[PDB]
Design a protein around this nucleic acid. Sequence first.
DNA 1: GCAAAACGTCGTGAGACAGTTTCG
DNA 2: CGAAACTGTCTCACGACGTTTTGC
Lengths: 152, 152
Amino acid sequence: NTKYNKEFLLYLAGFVDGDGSIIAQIKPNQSYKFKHQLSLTFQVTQKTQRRWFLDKLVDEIGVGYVRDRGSVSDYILSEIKPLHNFLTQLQPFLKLKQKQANLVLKIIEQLPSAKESPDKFLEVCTWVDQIAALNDSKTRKTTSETVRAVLD
Amino acid sequence: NTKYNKEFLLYLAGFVDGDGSIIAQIKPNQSYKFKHQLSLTFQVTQKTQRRWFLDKLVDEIGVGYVRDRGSVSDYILSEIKPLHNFLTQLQPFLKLKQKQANLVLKIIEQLPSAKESPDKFLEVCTWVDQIAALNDSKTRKTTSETVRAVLD
DNA sequence: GCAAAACGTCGTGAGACAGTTTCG
DNA sequence: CGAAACTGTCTCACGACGTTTTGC
Ligand SMILES: [Ca+2]
Ligand SMILES: [Ca+2]
């Protein structure tokens, strides 16, 4: 449980509400008990020419990594234990993304107990349904409705 | 001289490096001693549905206004005296737009002294030439080189 | 003459995903 | 079977300007 500075979290909080993104997805995968994977990721996008800023995040936050995708670069943090630790300390300073942040935290908490019941998985599959609305979604496909392919 | 909260500044700073934009322009206007106006402006843009955040900024920052422009809305601060006071307080916490913040501040200071010498005005038109380089410009027209219409 | 407000839009820099592969 | 990586992309939501008008 690595603890972060308050001035660090305050700034970042504003930058996250700015260019950050708190994604939560249900990815269809046959290798999973319920045919879908619950992906949770914290993104931070920026012009590759400004990648150094992204790289600096991997150092300051501790975990995570930075991917390159042409003209733009993202800083990705998908590791659940660390991510839950980050959003726990960050959540109190967010103003725009503070709802999804706490939703993602909620999902992480119920992830183990959602691997058991098909009814719970579907309910957690609903939390993410909420995050997507709160975000500015436009290219979403796999929703909790489709996850009801459980009826077999 | 209104003093802003340190935590308000810490958060806003990240958000400014996020969705904000510190601009400086040279607008061709015949009504001016040198045919050009030195326009300075602090912008903050968000989806019109998230405008409420911009209206909140008008309260917290004390000055400024919010304009509508379709799907998007901007919070604009163009007043010199209050702007200078705001950036002077914000500058230390910025991380991506600190250079331009200060350049703008440099400009404001030498604004009344550039209204006099066509040489001073051409030098300041240069500070702004620097801010644009620092920003992600791609629609710029009137630069200091063009300001050299002073050759009459 | 000039500070500041109006008003319009080019071209992305981003948000928010998707789909597939790897690893243990 | 799952956590987490790797790879790809639609559609903006933004940045950063430009032109014109106030009115004192
Ligand atoms: Ca944004
Ligand atoms: Ca940005």
